Amino acid sequence: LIMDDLVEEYVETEEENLVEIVESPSICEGFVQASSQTLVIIPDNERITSNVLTTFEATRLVAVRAQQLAINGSTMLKKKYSSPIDIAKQELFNRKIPLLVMRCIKVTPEGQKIVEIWNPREMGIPLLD
């Protein structure tokens, strides 16, 4: 009985050189749950990130708005359009998009999330064309 089509064999050859008494409490250790964070919004005069939307952020805004226009139907465009993509794009260009860009720069160990909330209607818009 020639079987053939063997499952081979697999070999790993390397080493991972990853460079007060105590007992078992259940509350001092463990706690897989992470502490709830508090949102610190950096004041509008202390924001040091770009006031021009990146192509990534502008694309994300347009995509989110287009999806929400696919589920909803409300908009502020005087010129009506037949596609949610067009409506969202013109909403971004006309500076009437109902979305905010939150840029997170910190995770403080005290459970503090420091963010900069940027208004796309006041921001510069990249090429996108």
Partner 1 sequence: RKEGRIRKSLLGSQVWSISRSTICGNSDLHLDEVGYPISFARTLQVAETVQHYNINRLMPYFLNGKRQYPGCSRVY
Partner 2 sequence: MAMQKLFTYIYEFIEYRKMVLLEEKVPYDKFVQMVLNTGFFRINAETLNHGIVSVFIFGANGKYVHHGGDMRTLLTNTLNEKKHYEELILIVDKPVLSKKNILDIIVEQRAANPTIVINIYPYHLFCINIPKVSAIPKHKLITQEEAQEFLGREYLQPQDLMQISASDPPVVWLGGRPGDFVQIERPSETAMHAVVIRFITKSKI
Partner 3 sequence: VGAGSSGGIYHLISRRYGPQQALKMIFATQQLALNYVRNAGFTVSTADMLLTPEAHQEVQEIINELLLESEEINNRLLHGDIMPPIGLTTHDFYEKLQLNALKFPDRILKPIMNSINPETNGLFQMVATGAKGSNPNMIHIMAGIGQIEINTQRIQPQFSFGRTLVYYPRFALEAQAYGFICNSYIAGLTSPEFIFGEMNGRFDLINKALSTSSTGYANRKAIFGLQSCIVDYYRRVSIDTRLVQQLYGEDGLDARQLETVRFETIMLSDQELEDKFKYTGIQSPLFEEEFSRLKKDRDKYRQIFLNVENFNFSQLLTDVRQVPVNVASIVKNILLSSTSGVLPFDEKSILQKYAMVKTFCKNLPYVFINNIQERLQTPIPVYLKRAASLMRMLIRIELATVKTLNITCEQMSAILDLIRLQYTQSLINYGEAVGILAAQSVSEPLTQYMLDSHHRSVAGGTNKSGIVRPQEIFSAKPVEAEQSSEMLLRLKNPEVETNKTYAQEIANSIELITFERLILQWHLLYETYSSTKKNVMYPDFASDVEWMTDFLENHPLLQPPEDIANWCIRLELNKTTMILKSISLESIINSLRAKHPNTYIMHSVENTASGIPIIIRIYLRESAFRRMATDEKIAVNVVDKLLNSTIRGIPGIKNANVVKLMRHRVDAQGKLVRLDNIYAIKTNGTNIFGAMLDDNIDPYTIVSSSIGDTMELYGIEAARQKIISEIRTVMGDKGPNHRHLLMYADLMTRTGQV
Give yes or no for residue 84 binding partner 1 (CB under 8 A).
Answer: yes
Instruction: Using alpha carbons, list the distances in angstroms from residue 125 to 27, 54, 73, 88, 94.
Output: 50, 8, 24, 13, 10
Least Å from the CB of residue 49 to partner 2 = 11
Site size with partner 3, rule: CB under 8 A: 19
Site size with partner 2, rule: CB under 8 A: 4
The option from partner 2, partner 1, partner 3, none interacting with 37 (CB < 5 to 8 A, set by class) reads none
Least Å from the CB of residue 129 to partner 3 = 7
Contact 78, 61 (CB under 8 A): no
Instruction: Using alpha carbons, list the distances in angstroms from residue 73 to 23, 51, 57.
Output: 60, 29, 23
| 102 closest CA partner among 49, 28, 63 | 49
The option from partner 3, partner 2, partner 1, none interacting with 114 (CB < 5 to 8 A, set by class) reads partner 2
Region 39-68 residues binding partner 3, contact defined as CB under 8 A: 44-45, 47-52, 54-57
Instruction: Using alpha carbons, list the distances in angstroms from residue 103 to 61, 92, 97, 113.
Output: 13, 18, 17, 10
Give yes or no for residue 100 binding partner 3 (CB under 8 A).
Answer: no
Question: Residue 28, CB half-sphere, CA atoms under 13 Å: how many?
Answer: 4
> Contact residues for partner 2 (CB under 8 A)?
48, 105-106, 114
Binding stretches for partner 3 (CB under 8 A): 44-45, 47-52, 54-57, 103, 105, 116, 124, 126-127, 129
